[PDB]
Amino acid sequence: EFITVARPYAKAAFDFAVEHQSVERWQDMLAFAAEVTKNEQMAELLSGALAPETLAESFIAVAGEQLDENGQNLIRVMAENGRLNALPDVLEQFIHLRAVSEATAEVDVISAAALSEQQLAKISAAMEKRLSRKVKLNAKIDKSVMAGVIIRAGDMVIDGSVRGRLERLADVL
Amino acid sequence: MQLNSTEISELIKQRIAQFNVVSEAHNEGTIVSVSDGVIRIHGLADCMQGEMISLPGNRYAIALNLERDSVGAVVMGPYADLAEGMKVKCTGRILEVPVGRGLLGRVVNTLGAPIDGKGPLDHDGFSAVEAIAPGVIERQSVDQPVQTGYKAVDSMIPIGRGQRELIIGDRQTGKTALAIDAIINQRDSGIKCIYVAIGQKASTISNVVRKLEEHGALANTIVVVATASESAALQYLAPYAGCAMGEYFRDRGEDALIIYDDLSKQAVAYRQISLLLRRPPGREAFPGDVFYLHSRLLERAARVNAEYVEAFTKGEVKGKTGSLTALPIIETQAGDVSAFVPTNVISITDGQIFLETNLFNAGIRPAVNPGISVSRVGGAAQTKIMKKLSGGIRTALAQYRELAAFSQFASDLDDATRKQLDHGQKVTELLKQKQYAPMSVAQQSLVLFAAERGYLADVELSKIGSFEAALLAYVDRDHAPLMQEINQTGGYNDEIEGKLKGILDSFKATQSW
Amino acid sequence: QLNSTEISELIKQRIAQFNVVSEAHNEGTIVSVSDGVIRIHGLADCMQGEMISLPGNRYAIALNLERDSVGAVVMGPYADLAEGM
Amino acid sequence: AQAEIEAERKRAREELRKQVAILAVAGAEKIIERSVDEAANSDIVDKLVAEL
Amino acid sequence: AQAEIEAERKRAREELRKQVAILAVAGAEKIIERSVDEAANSDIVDKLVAEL
Amino acid sequence: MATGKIVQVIGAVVDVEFPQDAVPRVYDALEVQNGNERLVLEVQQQLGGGIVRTIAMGSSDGLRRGLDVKDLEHPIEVPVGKATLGRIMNVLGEPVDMKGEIGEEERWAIHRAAPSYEELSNSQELLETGIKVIDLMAPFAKGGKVGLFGGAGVGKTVNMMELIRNIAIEHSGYSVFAGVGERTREGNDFYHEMTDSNVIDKVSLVYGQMNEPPGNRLRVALTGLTMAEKFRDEGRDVLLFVDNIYRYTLAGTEVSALLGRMPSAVGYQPTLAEEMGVLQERITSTKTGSITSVQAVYVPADDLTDPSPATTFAHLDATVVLSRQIASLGIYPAVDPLDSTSRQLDPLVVGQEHYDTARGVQSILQRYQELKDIIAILGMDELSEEDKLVVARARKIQRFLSQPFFVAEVFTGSPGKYVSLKDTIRGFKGIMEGEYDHLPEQAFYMVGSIEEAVEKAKKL
Amino acid sequence: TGKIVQVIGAVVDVEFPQDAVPRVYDALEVQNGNERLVLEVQQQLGGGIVRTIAMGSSDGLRRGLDVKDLEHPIEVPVGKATLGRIMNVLGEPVDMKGEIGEEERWAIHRAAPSYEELSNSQELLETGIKVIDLMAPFAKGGKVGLFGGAGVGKTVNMMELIRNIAIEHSGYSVFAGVGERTREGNDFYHEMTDSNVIDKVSLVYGQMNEPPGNRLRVALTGLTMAEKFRDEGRDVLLFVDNIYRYTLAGTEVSALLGRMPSAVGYQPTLAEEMGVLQERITSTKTGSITSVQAVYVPADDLTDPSPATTFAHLDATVVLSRQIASLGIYPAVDPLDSTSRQLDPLVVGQEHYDTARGVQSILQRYQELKDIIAILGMDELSEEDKLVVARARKIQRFLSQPFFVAEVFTGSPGKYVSLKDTIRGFKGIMEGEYDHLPEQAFYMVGSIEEAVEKAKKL
Numbered sequence A: 001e002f003i004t005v006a007r008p009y010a011k012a013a014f015d016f017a018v019e020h021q022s023v024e025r026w027q028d029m030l031a032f033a034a035e036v037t038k039n040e041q042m043a044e045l046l047s048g049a050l051a052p053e054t055l056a057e058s059f060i061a062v063a064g065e066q067l068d069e070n071g072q073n074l075i076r077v078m079a080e081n082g083r084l085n086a087l088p089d090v091l092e093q094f095i096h097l098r099a100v101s102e103a104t105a106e107v108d109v110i111s112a113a114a115l116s117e118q119q120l121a122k123i124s125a126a127m128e129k130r131l132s133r134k135v136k137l138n139a140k141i142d143k144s145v146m147a148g149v150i151i152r153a154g155d156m157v158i159d160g161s162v163r164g165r166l167e168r169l170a171d172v173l
Numbered sequence B: 001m002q003l004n005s006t007e008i009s010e011l012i013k014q015r016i017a018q019f020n021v022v023s024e025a026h027n028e029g030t031i032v033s034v035s036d037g038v039i040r041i042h043g044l045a046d047c048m049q050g051e052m053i054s055l056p057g058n059r060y061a062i063a064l065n066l067e068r069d070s071v072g073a074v075v076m077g078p079y080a081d082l083a084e085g086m087k088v089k090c091t092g093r094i095l096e097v098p099v100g101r102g103l104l105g106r107v108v109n110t111l112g113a114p115i116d117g118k119g120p121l122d123h124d125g126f127s128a129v130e131a132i133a134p135g136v137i138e139r140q141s142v143d144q145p146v147q148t149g150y151k152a153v154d155s156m157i158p159i160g161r162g163q164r165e166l167i168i169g170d171r172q173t174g175k176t177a178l179a180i181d182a183i184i185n186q187r188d189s190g191i192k193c194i195y196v197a198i199g200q201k202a203s204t205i206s207n208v209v210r211k212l213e214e215h216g217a218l219a220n221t222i223v224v225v226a227t228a229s230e231s232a233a234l235q236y237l238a239p240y241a242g243c244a245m246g247e248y249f250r251d252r253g254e255d256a257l258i259i260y261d262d263l264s265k266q267a268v269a270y271r272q273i274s275l276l277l278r279r280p281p282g283r284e285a286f287p288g289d290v291f292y293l294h295s296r297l298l299e300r301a302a303r304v305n306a307e308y309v310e311a312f313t314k315g316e317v318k319g320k321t322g323s324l325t326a327l328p329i330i331e332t333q334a335g336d337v338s339a340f341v342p343t344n345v346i347s348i349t350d351g352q353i354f355l356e357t358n359l360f361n362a363g364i365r366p367a368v369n370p371g372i373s374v375s376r377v378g379g380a381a382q383t384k385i386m387k388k389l390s391g392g393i394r395t396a397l398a399q400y401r402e403l404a405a406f407s408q409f410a411s412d413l414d415d416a417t418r419k420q421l422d423h424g425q426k427v428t429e430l431l432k433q434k435q436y437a438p439m440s441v442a443q444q445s446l447v448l449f450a451a452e453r454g455y456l457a458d459v460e461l462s463k464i465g466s467f468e469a470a471l472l473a474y475v476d477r478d479h480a481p482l483m484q485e486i487n488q489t490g491g492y493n494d495e496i497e498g499k500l501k502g503i504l505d506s507f508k509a510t511q512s513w
Numbered sequence C: 001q002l003n004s005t006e007i008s009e010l011i012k013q014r015i016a017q018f019n020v021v022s023e024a025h026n027e028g029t030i031v032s033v034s035d036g037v038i039r040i041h042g043l044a045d046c047m048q049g050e051m052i053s054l055p056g057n058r059y060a061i062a063l064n065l066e067r068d069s070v071g072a073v074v075m076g077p078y079a080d081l082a083e084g085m
Numbered sequence D, E: 001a002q003a004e005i006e007a008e009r010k011r012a013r014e015e016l017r018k019q020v021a022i023l024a025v026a027g028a029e030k031i032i033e034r035s036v037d038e039a040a041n042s043d044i045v046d047k048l049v050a051e052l
Numbered sequence F: 001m002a003t004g005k006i007v008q009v010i011g012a013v014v015d016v017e018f019p020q021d022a023v024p025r026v027y028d029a030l031e032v033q034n035g036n037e038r039l040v041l042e043v044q045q046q047l048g049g050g051i052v053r054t055i056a057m058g059s060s061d062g063l064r065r066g067l068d069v070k071d072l073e074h075p076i077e078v079p080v081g082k083a084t085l086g087r088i089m090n091v092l093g094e095p096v097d098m099k100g101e102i103g104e105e106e107r108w109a110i111h112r113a114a115p116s117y118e119e120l121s122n123s124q125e126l127l128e129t130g131i132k133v134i135d136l137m138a139p140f141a142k143g144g145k146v147g148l149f150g151g152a153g154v155g156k157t158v159n160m161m162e163l164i165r166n167i168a169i170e171h172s173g174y175s176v177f178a179g180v181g182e183r184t185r186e187g188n189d190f191y192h193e194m195t196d197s198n199v200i201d202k203v204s205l206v207y208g209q210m211n212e213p214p215g216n217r218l219r220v221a222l223t224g225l226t227m228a229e230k231f232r233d234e235g236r237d238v239l240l241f242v243d244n245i246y247r248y249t250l251a252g253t254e255v256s257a258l259l260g261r262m263p264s265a266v267g268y269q270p271t272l273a274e275e276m277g278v279l280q281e282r283i284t285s286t287k288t289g290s291i292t293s294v295q296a297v298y299v300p301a302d303d304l305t306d307p308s309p310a311t312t313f314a315h316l317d318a319t320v321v322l323s324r325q326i327a328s329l330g331i332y333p334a335v336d337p338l339d340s341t342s343r344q345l346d347p348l349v350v351g352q353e354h355y356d357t358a359r360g361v362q363s364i365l366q367r368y369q370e371l372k373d374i375i376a377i378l379g380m381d382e383l384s385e386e387d388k389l390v391v392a393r394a395r396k397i398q399r400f401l402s403q404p405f406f407v408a409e410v411f412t413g414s415p416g417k418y419v420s421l422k423d424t425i426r427g428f429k430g431i432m433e434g435e436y437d438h439l440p441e442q443a444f445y446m447v448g449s450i451e452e453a454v455e456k457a458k459k460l
Numbered sequence G: 001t002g003k004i005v006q007v008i009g010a011v012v013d014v015e016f017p018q019d020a021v022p023r024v025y026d027a028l029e030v031q032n033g034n035e036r037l038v039l040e041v042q043q044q045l046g047g048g049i050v051r052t053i054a055m056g057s058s059d060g061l062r063r064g065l066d067v068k069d070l071e072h073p074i075e076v077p078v079g080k081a082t083l084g085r086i087m088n089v090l091g092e093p094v095d096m097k098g099e100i101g102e103e104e105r106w107a108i109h110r111a112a113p114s115y116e117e118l119s120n121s122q123e124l125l126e127t128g129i130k131v132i133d134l135m136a137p138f139a140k141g142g143k144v145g146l147f148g149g150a151g152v153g154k155t156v157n158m159m160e161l162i163r164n165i166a167i168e169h170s171g172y173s174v175f176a177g178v179g180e181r182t183r184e185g186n187d188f189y190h191e192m193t194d195s196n197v198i199d200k201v202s203l204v205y206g207q208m209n210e211p212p213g214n215r216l217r218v219a220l221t222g223l224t225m226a227e228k229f230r231d232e233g234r235d236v237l238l239f240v241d242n243i244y245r246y247t248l249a250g251t252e253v254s255a256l257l258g259r260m261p262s263a264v265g266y267q268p269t270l271a272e273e274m275g276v277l278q279e280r281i282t283s284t285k286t287g288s289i290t291s292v293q294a295v296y297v298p299a300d301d302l303t304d305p306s307p308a309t310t311f312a313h314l315d316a317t318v319v320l321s322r323q324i325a326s327l328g329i330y331p332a333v334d335p336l337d338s339t340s341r342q343l344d345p346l347v348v349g350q351e352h353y354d355t356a357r358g359v360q361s362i363l364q365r366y367q368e369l370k371d372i373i374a375i376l377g378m379d380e381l382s383e384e385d386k387l388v389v390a391r392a393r394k395i396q397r398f399l400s401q402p403f404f405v406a407e408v409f410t411g412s413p414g415k416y417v418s419l420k421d422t423i424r425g426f427k428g429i430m431e432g433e434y435d436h437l438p439e440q441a442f443y444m445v446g447s448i449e450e451a452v453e454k455a456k457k458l
């Protein structure tokens, strides 16, 4: 996995995109560069050993949607270290760093069935106290949690389900 | 009678009553890998080292590494059914184990979960499995005696309350026999016992449990079991779960006794867990810290002065002093006492009882080899009478057992060696003792009397064994009040010397044997 | 995976200018310190066996010339030397 | 032979308690799945948010 | 005594069947408080009774 | 349907990649079409990222990358029960003799937990073998492990055949023979020697020989064991033979080095003791039935300290040694009474009469052992007339340990004898105290019980 | 300012702002739950990270904790105020008494004295032990080492030397307990307080219960005290309880600091970790330190790297052996391996030197004979070789002595045998003057005049 090697590159890209007030452009550029990495024939090229500057020059050529100096420079550096495969994760960590920078969050709400459209408003109102961040509740359904709700925000979950209560009771006995 | 439906129903109804319907917020992660017993978890941004991570099913994994992006943990149980992508929960708990005197008589898994059929535990809360032993100022010097059932160790190798005494020998030499004879003998002397079996065969554990229940000791012991089948992460963490329960009595000013059966197998399970984490091995392929593993465990066995008890117990227990004796058992290949693990433990404990296969196969049982075995506290631990009657006996036999070497063909100093060599031989023939036959301080004292004061060199070497069986009934019939006094107090005076001379003269003269 | 002296505040400079400015080939900066070995970043014109001069009056011997690192051993007490020197 | 029977009384008592205790929760599952199908859900989801 | 326990076991086992219906309700209505669950319960609870 | 694809192949180790949400659990069995025939892979590790690492139960030649893999949802399962008597099988339970299908009604997974703590029997009994040397000097605990240490030419396989006969006929059990990692030739001319002795109908054979990939030689010991466990659950007593436990340890080391784990004590895997224990811990006496094991042990480099023996011996309850010398002396079975041991020889578990009788005959033989070397150099004349009687009795004790097996008829025409324990204790109590000093030594040889030794003596 | 980012075993890792990164050996602090934990930094990894060893229990540390940068190394109380008190590795008082009223605190990492400042002394030191000051005499202001495997007696010997040297001497003393039993530290502490010599001894304890971070550095903070007493112009006794645990605590940590393993697993920096310690413990022109060090040898193997690298750092090396303690011959010193820099005719006098070399010569000639004795039995020896065997077996016993601290184990009272008298007794045995006594006359006696009496009793 590339999560541990994507961290420096994501932090550098974000530290740069902040100073030039180009976060919104960098994110789209990184998303495109990550999508090319997923292509059938390109991924074949990225494995077989090839001199980094030649691999980067072949990679740049496939991206006219990259800003003239800094995006291509990032690609060159990563190609030198041989980490172009890490891009799909440099994107993840770029978005996460942005969410931290803009004090924003995004939380799952898992329910037996959809909510009252004011229950969403009350959930968000509550959450923006637990979290300083502005929240977007993207909602889901799962009838195995036959009643109540699960709220998941990152690696924190608040389990208000009936299924949860039953599993918690059945082990107290 | 005691299958009353109503009591079961109320037992459950209580649980329904005190059930917190309120939810709770917890921290979560996903399993990313599984192999040979080790887990790799993403997330858990709030897991703390040594923590218990809770898996699907009802089982736990212990966090060993908090790397930059992943938590490394060992599964404490069967791990085959865990699959990548399963969720896990971070409990707030460093590794914990139930403790209390309500465990006494129960047979317990290394996590406290009972393994006999007799249902849930009654326990006085929980205690942390990994703790640091009392410091240098909180100790007190070991003073009081712990009686085993045996002549050979109670005379030559005395054990005090708060001492750590290694039992080391070859395999099938009577190590476990001597240990569970120590446990049986505290059946009535007020110190609670714990027997933690690591890597044993399951049948053998059920057999020792059967003997413990058969001699009436079981109601006074806790039995911790992690058998040869169970995952290495259970075996290597077993004895810490035993010390966590022993330390419950040490801190309340009471006394305990704990037996780690084959710390060798704990070292082997830890070597496994270590090598599966790619750690560089060292000598004999053991990890670098295989010493510290035993060091931080045996060091918990200690005796603590009364101020530590009063401070720990918030002033509820006054003036008393607690202790936790420990008898680790080590197995050595081919009688080699110089290997990396046997030496590591000889360097941690306060002595060793070395059981020799050559004596054991010759019929001398218990096969205590004097000369290698020692007690690093020595006489401070003995009752007043025993420290007198013992003399320097252990070096007496350690000499007789090389006079017996050179006297295999020819020798000088003839007639003095004659009597040295006869005393040694009838003494060794006297120190051998049957299994499950513990003899009290009063029963053992008059026999050592009969040993050192002559009353010997006339009776036949074959008759030594029945001289004893007759004498211990003669004094059980007639002079019973004197046995009753010597049992109650160590009691050494020259009134008791006179009474013992009189009893032994009258026996020697009047009775047949 | 493993990282090899690719770190945020170095990478940002390349982002701004990948075609390295011709920084003095006569000098570099310490990136690491440990057990008497230091990793130096830069020093394109370092030669194996050369003497590298540190703050104070101290020297190191360039032993490992690698791609994007010079591994040198300090002569005398090393505890003083700190990354960024 | 007496302790050997005492242990068996304890073990049989526990054996029975186990069955009753699992059937309890199976019954609670079905009973709960019969009776919360209504607006009762709106109460549950509003209950935790006041404590959320 | 082992033969006697096989009688005491059945004696208690039969009678608990009438208590499982109590305990199932107690649990379910602990876990969701807004239910009579006596209006439409026969299909559930009678086979709860049956299993013990 | 097939939902995985092979991603690596390196020798016996095949890596397959599954969907993120459908990864096989460990020890699950996969299967692929290795060209014209199917191949079964047993999972070992879940590397991250949907990938899983597996070991092929067969040759891996011909495996391309990108082949389809079908995830079976269960561990390797084998046929069990009466239907498997007299058949031969490989690891995976396919019939490997030419007799066609096995009509088994039931199939079990070969990986399972050992008997829990309170399932074990609250007793400690003896398996009556019916063999004088074994039942006297090295009794078998019912549900215990036994190590058989002799070499070759001394009669290991005829001993095993006699044990099979006795446990099937005199008791009412069955037997299983697991041929871990040994010469194919021996397996063939063992299967044939058993059919011409009509024991084949009471034993179930499973074979993984030296020519098999490591994945076969490793698990084969668990297939036989999980057939024996089925016979146990039917309430029977079983006898389980493992043809070499050392080669089980060695197949474990080979697989370990294939998966890439660090070596431990003398090159052995890190999990040596656990791989051994999870096998040896299923062979026990449950309340329902027993499995008793007889395991041929090979000790490397004549070293009883090497980690492999040092681990095995921790589990054995008895130990019978066969000797070339006792064989050359024409006594059969060629068990060695001095080196054979059993940790059931204790007055508590076997009683005092049996104990002291065994101890007496042992001391008799081990004095004779040196009187023979006196005689070798000084000649018989030099001995005291006590030692001449010691020799005359030692020779008769030594003879009386011979026995005619039901299986040995083919060799010697004499009808085989089953010697109940009481008869052995009496015979040796007798000889050892001068009773029957009045009849010649050849009246004890190959006889049976002593109440037949006298009647043979009657007509020399 | 700074976050934890990994917590592997005892080595914690911390991330700092690029400009705030701490120096090496600086001390950090973390608020571990309801504890305060001190970390000492070992390496400056790249990019602001710094790697540290925890001077405490590492359990309970989460990632992302805030850590505070102290701007100075570990510093300990020093001087006269630290006298008769027990102290932690961190210099905290570990007895129940109050604060240490120290005037001054010193960093525990220091440079060794210069070659120009060292000083040498041939002034011999007398200890009552017979074998030690015959075979291995040692000089005031010089290192001694007691090498031996587990159970062979290298702690009883050190308490004997403490009794014989430290109470009969005026200057202060320091006892540093590195990684050995807490029971013995308590017994020692109470033995001092029960003879009022406690107010001349300064104690430091990193006993075996403690985590690696403590046992690793505890020896340096005992040095740092002996060093003060030295530089004040005094002369000091320094007893180190087991200097082997100082390297074992390093081996335990090295693998985690990412350092490839060396010969038997040891850290690659073994000889330097050992040298930089053993080099600050030396006398000098301004003062002097006399030190006895117990040096465990693992698996009884004298070739192991950890003992082997230590022999070079000592003046008098006393090597104990198990195959002598098993004969009951305490102290089980091996006279064919004990040695001293001071055993030279000009330093010790010709008669003492010739006596020592005679004892060695004939104990060695006895060693050569043992194989033929073990095979062919003693009767095949020449008639003037049986004499050598019988004199060697006498010398072996006469090297035995009853200590004042071994009464607890043997009852028999201790003895103090002056040098003048031992070098007479051994001449007596070698020249055949006492060639008419039974061996057991020499076992556990003091002077030769106590052997001849014991022979009257047989």
Ligand SMILES: Nc1ncnc2c1ncn2[C@@H]1O[C@H](COP(=O)(O)OP(=O)(O)OP(=O)(O)O)[C@@H](O)[C@H]1O
Pocket (backbone or CB within 6 Å): B170, B171, B172, B173, B174, B175, B176, B177, B178, B331, B365, B366, B433, B434, B435, F343, F346
């Ligand atoms: N005092 C004694 N007299 C006679 N026999 C004894 C005595 N003590 C023990 N034994 C015998 O020794 C045998 C082995 O004892 P035990 O199992 O305690 O040794 P062990 O070292 O625990 O063996 P293992 O190491 O295999 O567990 C037992 O069968 C027991 O009968």
Ligand SMILES: Nc1ncnc2c1ncn2[C@@H]1O[C@H](COP(=O)(O)OP(=O)(O)O)[C@@H](O)[C@H]1O
Pocket (backbone or CB within 6 Å): F151, F152, F153, F154, F155, F156, F157, F158, F332, F333, F334, F405, F408, F411, F412
């Ligand atoms: N009890 C016995 N009765 C008759 N013959 C025997 C007996 N034991 C061994 N033999 C003879 O000794 C030979 C041993 O050969 P074999 O059985 O092949 O050795 P192993 O079985 O150890 O491989 C047999 O062929 C057999 O003829």
Ligand SMILES: Nc1ncnc2c1ncn2[C@@H]1O[C@H](COP(=O)(O)OP(=O)(O)O)[C@@H](O)[C@H]1O
Pocket (backbone or CB within 6 Å): B347, B374, B375, B376, B377, G148, G149, G150, G151, G152, G153, G154, G155, G156, G157, G330, G331, G401, G402, G403, G406, G409, G410
């Ligand atoms: N001079 C002596 N007299 C009698 N016994 C001794 C003597 N020296 C050592 N022993 C025995 O050997 C043991 C050695 O103890 P100790 O030196 O503390 O072990 P270590 O050498 O491992 O520190 C003591 O417990 C004692 O039993």
Ligand SMILES: [Mg+2]
Pocket (backbone or CB within 6 Å): B175, B176, B177
């Ligand atoms: Mg045992």
Ligand SMILES: [Mg+2]
Pocket (backbone or CB within 6 Å): G154, G155, G180
């Ligand atoms: Mg010591």
